[PDB]
Structure 1
Amino acid sequence: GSHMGSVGLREIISEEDVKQVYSILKEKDISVDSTTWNRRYREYMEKIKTGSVFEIAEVLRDLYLLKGDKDLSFGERKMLDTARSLLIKELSLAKDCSEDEIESDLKKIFNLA
């Protein structure tokens, strides 16, 4: 049984995956190249609809480190606005609080504040 698609799951997860997801974005050396960024926008744009939880978190993360700052540009904010509403949605399980738990934790992950 071979397949080179998505990880398998969608968004329905528990605190188990949440701990793993944070570990994916915990690294700061993931900063994508500018020449490749133009094409990365395309793949990541589909990850918002077809991409799994482990992918959504990588998407918004790349966009955050691509700017190297907190208040992202209008261009990154366009796709990030969607990936944000999905970031806290899956992680909501382990959040056990307001959206600020994950939304503000971005500063601790991407080192913004």
Structure 2
Amino acid sequence: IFKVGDTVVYPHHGAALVEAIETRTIKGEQKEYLVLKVAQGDLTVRVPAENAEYVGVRDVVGQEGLDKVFQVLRAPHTEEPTNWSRRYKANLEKLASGDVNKVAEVVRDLWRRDQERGLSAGEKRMLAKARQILVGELALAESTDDAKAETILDEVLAA
């Protein structure tokens, strides 16, 4: 499941290159602690393989998720609760879930709304963060690189 040199996805930092694994015996138990490095924060995260999936670490998603997110980007007829607070909480929880589909839907909806009439700074921050993580994830999804990943995001949002 976990192999050296694999570009594994760890939430909510997106891509996270593995380096190695260490015994790190604690309580007399050589609990395996595999080490990930994320290029965004330049931090190392050591996680246990036995419950690694419990935290939410996932491998690079294939092309099935790629076409899924494209189709979802072409999913119309979205309505939100009237109050701004409720919809903000909903999309923030959607981002926190780490599900690629949920964050993609949040990003697209917020971007279409912002481009519709322009909103605010907090929504802008949410959109920037979510778009950043999505572009990184897609870049590694097809190893298409961050710049070309941003451009493909920019063409596909056009529909």
The structure with more strand, counted as a fraction of residues = 2
Contact 2:139 2:146 (8 Å CA) reproduced: yes
Q: What is the aligned counterpart of 1:104 among 151, 154, 159?
A: 151
Tell me which residue corresponds to 1:68.
Answer: 115
Shift of 1:43: 1.1
Identity of matched residues, %: 33
Contact 1:21 1:57 (8 Å CA) reproduced: yes
Matched, 1:79 2:126: yes
Shift of 1:84: 1.3
Query: Greater Rg, structure 1 or structure 2?
Result: 2
Tell me which residue corresponds to 1:18.
Answer: 66
Say which SS state the counterpart of residue 48 (structure 1) adopts.
helix
Structure 2 CA distance for aligned equivalents of residues 74 and 107 of structure 1: 21
- Sort the Cα spacing of 1:30 and 1:38 in 2 relative to 1 into closer, same or farther, 3 A: farther
Q: What is the aligned counterpart of 2:101 among 47, 51, 54?
A: 54
Contact 2:60 2:141 (8 Å CA) reproduced: no
The structure with more helix, counted as a fraction of residues = 1
Q: Which fold has the larger relative contact order, with Cα–Cα distance below 8 Å and residues 6 or more apart in sequence?
A: 1
Give the aligned CA root-mean-square deviation in angstroms: 3.0
Tell me which residue corresponds to 2:13.
Answer: none
Q: TM-score, normalised by structure 2?
A: 0.51
Shift of 1:58: 0.5
Structure 2 CA distance for aligned equivalents of residues 30 and 37 of structure 1: 18
Matched positions, count: 103
Tell me which residue corresponds to 1:3.
Answer: none
Contact 2:66 2:141 (8 Å CA) reproduced: yes
Q: TM-score, normalised by structure 1?
A: 0.67
Contact 1:56 1:83 (8 Å CA) reproduced: yes
Structure 2 CA distance for aligned equivalents of residues 99 and 49 of structure 1: 22
Contact 2:94 2:103 (8 Å CA) reproduced: yes
Structure 2 CA distance for aligned equivalents of residues 72 and 96 of structure 1: 33
- Sort the Cα spacing of 1:31 and 1:11 in 2 relative to 1 into closer, same or farther, 3 A: farther
Tell me which residue corresponds to 1:4.
Answer: none
Q: What is the aligned counterpart of 2:89 among 31, 42, 47?
A: 42
Structure 1 CA distance for aligned equivalents of residues 108 and 90 of structure 2: 14
Unpaired stretches in structure 1, ≥5 consecutive residues: 1-7
